[PDB]
Every structure is written in structure tokens, then in C-alpha cells.
Amino acid sequence: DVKPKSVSHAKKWSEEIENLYRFQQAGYRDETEYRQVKQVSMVDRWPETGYVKKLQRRDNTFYYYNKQRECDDKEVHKVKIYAY
Amino acid sequence: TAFRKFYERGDFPIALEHDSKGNKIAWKVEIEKLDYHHYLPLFFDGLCEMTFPYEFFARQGIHDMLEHGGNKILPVLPQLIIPIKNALNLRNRQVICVTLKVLQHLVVSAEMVGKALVPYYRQILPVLNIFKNNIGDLIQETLEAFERYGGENAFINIKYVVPTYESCL
């Protein structure tokens, strides 16, 4: 029941925005909700880039994410940024 | 010893060098840029460390990250409860004192951390009964910090787990 206070939308891409994109693609606000919802030891990330590699969705299917950036410039504005 | 593996790993974000001029630690990376979801729990996993090189970089590491974490600390609080519990459950007096000072720092490091800690009192507070009376007064001082920054539900939840607790302020 640690929940964010407020939500804004991204305006330029970032490493943070990329990982937020990948969490929200799989249906989680961020790693805080994803670890709340799922029993998580580690979040599997790419070695060189740190980006999220795979996520188990709410229906227990999995999303896989590319080593390189996936959030194109058109999508940046749709990523939600949550403050705690 | 997940910290011992973290230590001297590649991702370890502190430079392993000692400058004569003090006991500051040199960060290879800026604290602001670290993913606290990954780093802060690893540093808290060092609360169990007592051997010389490790314990220093664990404690000073926790100190700086809490002092400069800001709004990065609250979203990570759930991931710290197991490391806090494990350190305290060693029933080592020195690990418990270091952890208590850290818990004091935790609940003042950022807004709402103290309140968000209340649901976990029953997971971390029990050991302190053994040592409830210098560790006794540090437990008392820590519990007052918890209650002071814990919101309206803090005392009742401190008392459920610490029946002998009492505090005016």
C-alpha cells in the first residue's frame, strides 16, 4: 500500500522513461507496483543497458523487451511519471 | 552476504579508495541517478555485515543514499523490510544498534516513509522486546522516532508489538 502521490506525463525520452514505458506496457505503473503485485526477487534487466528484459503480466503471460530502446519518440508523451 | 557479492562487483557504485582527508566515500556514480529499487536493498543487505571492509561501505553507503535519496526512498520501502528483519533477527547487539540508528534515519529521510513503515512494525519490531531495557534507550529512542513520524496509527501499532512501550512525545 505504498502508492504514488501524483502523475505527470513525460516530455523527453530517458532511461527512466524507457523502463517506465516497459512497466506500463505490461500493465504496471512502475517497479513499485510490479513488485507489489508479483512475488519478485529480481527484475530481469539487460546487462549492458539496464533496461527491463521481461515482465510477468497480471494474467501470468510474459512480455519480453529488446536490449535496445523500444519507446519511440511518438510514445514518450504517453509514459506516466508517478511521484511518491 | 549478498552485499559481499555486491561489493567489488561491477555495478558496485562506490570507489574503493581511502583519502586521508576524512572518512567520506567516493561515489563512482551520482547517487541521484541510481535505481534505488536495485541499490538501496543491496546496501541494506549489508546491515548484517560486521567484517571490516564491508561494514564501512554498507553503513556509509546507506547513510548517503538515505540523506540524498529524496523521493526515491519511499517507492523502495517494501524491499527493505526483509533486510531490516534479517539484521535484527541475528540478535547481535551491534547489528541491532547500527540498524536502529538506520531506522531512525529512514523515517526522517523523506515524507511519508515513517507512516508507510507502520504496516511492517509486526515484522521488524519483535526482536526489540528481547533487548527492551546502550541498547535499551536506543530502542526507546527509535520507537519514539517511529511514532513521531508515523502518523495517527503509529503508537497503537508500536504497542501491539511492544506491549511495554510508552511515550508522551
Q: Is B82 on the interface with A (CB under 8 A)?
A: no
For residues B134 and B91, give the distance between their C-alpha atoms in angstroms, rounded to a whole number.
Answer: 15
For residues A66 and A53, give the distance between their C-alpha atoms in angstroms, rounded to a whole number.
Answer: 7
Cβ-Cβ contacts under 8 Å, B116 against chain A = 1-2
Nearest to A28 by CA among B6, B161, A19: A19
Q: Cell triple for residue B159? A: 504497542
SS3 B34: coil
**Strand locations in chain B, DSSP E?**
14-15, 26-27
**Resolution of this deposited model, Å:** 2.6
Question: Which residue shows C-alpha cell 521488524?
Answer: B124
For residues B99 and B92, give the distance between their C-alpha atoms in angstroms, rounded to a whole number.
Answer: 10
> How many CB atoms sit inside 10 A of residue B32's CB?
9
Q: Cell triple for residue B32? A: 541521484
Which amino acid, B120?
Y
Task: For residue A64, report the phi and psi dihedrals to the nearest 5 degrees.
Answer: -110, 145
Q: Cell triple for residue B49? A: 555485515
For residues A74 and A10, give the distance between their C-alpha atoms in angstroms, rounded to a whole number.
Answer: 11
DSSP assignment of B110-140 equals STTHHHHTGGGHHHHSTHHHHH---HHHHHH
Nearest to B160 by CA among B143, B142, B141: B143
**Among chain B residues, CA nearest to A1:** B116
For residues A53 and A39, give the distance between their C-alpha atoms in angstroms, rounded to a whole number.
Answer: 17
For residues B112 and A31, give the distance between their C-alpha atoms in angstroms, rounded to a whole number.
Answer: 19
For residues B75 and A79, give the distance between their C-alpha atoms in angstroms, rounded to a whole number.
Answer: 18
SS3 B58: helix
Q: Cell triple for residue A18? A: 524507457
Handedness of CA A67, A79, B41, B67 (dihedral sign): positive
Task: For residue A7, report the phi and psi dihedrals to the nearest 5 degrees.
Answer: -135, 130
Residues of chain A numbered 55-84 and touching chain B (CB < 8 Å): 83-84
Rg (CA), chain A: 12
Q: Is B127 on the interface with A (CB under 8 A)?
A: no
Domain boundaries, chain A: 1-84
Partner residue facing A2 (CB), from B35, B71, B74 = B74
Q: Is B35 on the interface with A (CB under 8 A)?
A: yes
Method of determination? X-ray
Burial of B66 (0-12, 13-18, 19+ CB in 10 A): buried
Nearest to B100 by CA among B67, B133, B142: B142
Q: Is A44 on the interface with B (CB under 8 A)?
A: no
